[PDB]
Structures are given as structure tokens and as C-alpha cells.
Design a protein around this ligand. Structure first.
Ligand code: ACO
Ligand code: IHP
Length: 336
């Protein structure tokens, strides 16, 4: 019985359910039309940044329910609280990292971390001894690879200096707007590789040799954070699935040939097979002239759509308190 679980608000719950599915379905429809027509969202004046920021807390709820133990939490860094620098306020329900680390129950967490303009994924472990975190950044655009040293130290600082930290920049993102969806995907993969990340957490906490987990690593020697400039095999083929540039995927396989024959999904595709299937040629904004035509993988825009599909299905049959919480999260996206 549904009425048993409705607590006398069947009318309110029903309307709020329709309201939430209505939004998810609306976004989904627009994003699907754009993808089906091989159209770049920015050039089409679709504001993905706003749509992603609004749907992201709802995706987190759906994914946490869909995978018990994922324990995905949205977090933000200090600079995300700066109204004058940040590109967007943090998503609804986002917690300040310092506040989270302080009060969080001990356990295993995933996170998407917002700095005000960019989002990364993270795997977090807090217990009596302290907190350890492994950050994977889907973006790797720095010319001089010394800037990553600073990134590693800054994250370690957010978690405090007695927290163990690993920072792994990966060349996945090429577009301006895909950080959120890529980070959510990376977070999910972390839960999928729970054991592998747990093992890395132990090495961090015990100060052992990182090369049991990753191929290239170094100490910042300012905070002691481990900067990982080559995550394989911790960063395996499955974590490279949504690589936007064909050359990023190719270069990765060229550098780690052993990754080229492992199946990345249940249909038994290799990374190269799957990536090739997602290749499209379309105009994108250049950042003279305004637009530039490129060939790249549309895997991320498909993933966004798949995530929405999941989320909507979940909402359609979700219990009333969950509907209530997601409706609220949707409303709260308009407060800052
Ligand atoms: O980056 P620049 O090198 O400055 O411009 P370029 O267009 O060469 O971008 C290089 C790669 O990023 C990819 N790329 C650039 N912008 C985007 C974008 N907005 N969305 C997806 N992929 C992109 C290109 O497809 C290219 O992949 P290739 O090396 O396989 O061709
Ligand atoms: O990380 P998840 O959200 O849980 O999704 C992944 C994955 O999607 P990714 O590309 O992001 O890795 C696969 O999908 P694709 O390779 O086709 O894109 C897969 O689907 P298939 O194995 O059937 O191909 C399946 O999602 P689903 O079972 O809902 O279709 C899967 O989940 P798991 O990795 O947890 O098993």
C-alpha cells in the first residue's frame, strides 16, 4: 500500500513527485534532443551549468540509494564560499570540507568537490586515527606540471594538515562544463573499486610505497601530500571511459597497453571499442572564429542522460520522505 506510507499527504506527495520527475524529464528531453541532433549545448544556448548544478544533488540521492555504501557527499572548498570569485554557488546541500571532516561520523565516503568553478571526485576515509582522502581530478590542463603540486597541497589544507592526501589529475575532461558529471562518474567508479582505494588509503596512512597502487608519485614536501602524475593501475580503463578527446584515450592505452584488452562493461567492449562507438564530429565554441569543428567522444553527454534516466525512474517509485527531500533540494537550488 502507498497510502500506508503517505502519512496523510498523498496530494502533496503526489504533486511534489510530479514536480520533481517533471523537471528531470524536461531536462532529459532537452538534453536528448541536443544529443540526438549532434548539437553542442553551449552553442545551442542551453545552460548546462545551471541544469547540472540543479540536478546534481538529486543524482547523488538516487545513486546513494541505488548503491548502498557509495555514501556520496557533496563538498566544497573555502573559495567556493567566495561570492566574488566563484562561477556558481555550491549545489544545494553541499557541505564545507572543514565542517564535514570535523563532524562526520567515522566511515567511508565518496565526494564531488566544488571549488567554485571546478569539480573533482574524492574517496574519503575517516576514523579514530584521522581522515585520509584520495582526490581524482577529471581535468588535466596545466602546461607546467608543477601547478599540480599546489593543487595537492591546497586540497590537503582543506582537510587539514594532519589528514593524509593523494591528488591524481587525469586527462578526461576537454569541455568547459562536464566536470560535475565526470566527477560523479569517477565517484561511482571509486565505490566500484572500493578495495583498491581502501588499500591506497592504508599506504597513505602508514607512509608506505605508493607504487603498489600507482605508477608515478611524489611528495609535495610542503604538506607531504602524495601527488600522483600517473594513476594507473588504480586509474584503469574503466575510469577512462568518458575521455572526451580520442587522443586522451589513445595516449593512455599507448602508455598502458595492458589496459587495452580489459572489458569496460558487460557488453564486453574494450576502452577503444567503446570510445570509437561514441565518436561524433560537431561544432563547439572556441576558447577567431567563434566556433571550431572537432571530433570527440560524446560519452559524457550520454552519461548525463543515463544518470537522469536513473534518477527519474527512482523518483517515480521512491517513498514519500525521499520525494520530499528531493523536492526540497530542487527548491533549495534557487536560494544563493
Ligand atoms: O585543446 P587545443 O589543443 O587547444 O584545441 P584542440 O581542438 O586541438 O583540442 C584538442 C583535443 O581536445 C578535444 N576537444 C577540444 N575541445 C573540446 C570540447 N569542447 N568538447 C570535447 N572535446 C574537445 C578535441 O577533439 C581534440 O581531441 P584530438 O586531439 O583527438 O583531436
Ligand atoms: O558506474 P555506473 O553508473 O554504475 O554504470 C556502469 C556503466 O556506465 P559507465 O560508462 O559510466 O561506466 C556501464 O555502462 P556503459 O559502458 O554501457 O556506458 C554499465 O552498463 P553495461 O555494463 O550493461 O554496458 C552499468 O550500468 P547499467 O547496468 O545500469 O546498464 C554500469 O554499472 P556497474 O559498473 O556498477 O556494474
Amino acid at each position: 500500500a502507498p497510502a500506508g506510507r503517505q502519512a496523510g499527504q498523498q496530494a502533496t506527495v503526489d504533486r511534489l513527485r510530479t514536480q520533481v520527475t517533471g523537471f528531470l524529464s524536461g531536462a532529459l528531453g532537452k538534453l536528448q534532443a541536443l544529443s540526438a541532433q549532434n548539437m553542442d549545448p553551449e552553442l545551442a544556448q542551453f545552460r548546462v551549468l545551471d541544469v547540472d548544478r540543479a540536478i546534481m544533488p538529486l543524482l547523488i540521492v538516487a545513486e546513494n540509494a541505488r548503491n548502498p555504501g557509495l555514501n556520496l557527499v557533496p563538498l566544497h572548498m573555502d573559495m567556493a564560499e567566495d561570492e566574488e570569485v566563484r562561477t556558481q554557488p555550491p549545489m544545494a546541500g553541499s557541505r564545507h570540507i572543514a565542517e564535514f571532516v570535523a563532524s562526520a561520523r567515522p566511515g567511508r565516503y565518496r565526494a564531488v568537490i566544488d571549488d567554485g568553478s571546478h569539480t573533482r571526485a574524492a574517496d574519503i576515509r575517516k576514523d579514530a586515527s584521522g581522515t585520509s582522502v584520495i582526490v581524482v581530478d577529471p581535468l588535466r590542463k596545466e602546461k607546467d606540471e608543477s601547478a599540480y603540486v599546489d593543487y595537492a597541497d591546497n586540497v590537503n589544507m582543506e582537510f587539514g594538515e594532519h589528514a593524509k592526501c593523494a591528488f591524481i589529475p587525469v586527462d578526461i575532461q576537454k569541455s568547459f562544463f562536464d566536470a560535475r558529471i565526470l566527477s560523479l562518474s569517477l565517484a561511482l567508479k571509486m565505490h566500484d573499486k572500493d578495495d583498491a582505494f581502501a588499500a591506497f588509503h592504508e599506504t597513505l596512512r602508514n607512509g608506505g610505497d605508493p607504487s603498489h597502487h600507482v605508477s608515478r608519485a611524489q611528495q609535495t614536501e610542503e604538506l607531504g601530500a602524495t601527488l600522483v602524475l600517473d594513476g594507473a593501475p588504480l586509474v584503469d580503463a574503466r575510469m577512462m571511459k568518458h575521455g572526451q578527446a580520442a587522443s586522451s584515450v589513445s595516449r593512455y592505452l599507448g602508455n598502458h597497453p595492458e589496459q587495452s584488452t580489459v572489458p569496460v562493461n558487460k557488453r564486453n567492449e574494450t576502452l577503444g571499442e567503446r570510445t570509437t562507438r561514441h565518436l561524433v564530429k560537431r561544432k563547439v565554441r572556441n576558447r577567431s572564429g567563434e566556433t571550431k569543428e572537432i571530433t570527440f567522444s560524446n560519452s559524457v553527454e550520454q552519461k548525463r542522460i543515463a544518470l537522469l534516466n536513473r534518477a527519474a525512474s527512482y523518483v517515480n517509485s521512491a517513498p514519500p520522505p525521499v520525494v520530499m527531500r528531493m523536492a526540497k533540494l530542487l527548491q533549495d537550488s534557487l536560494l544563493d
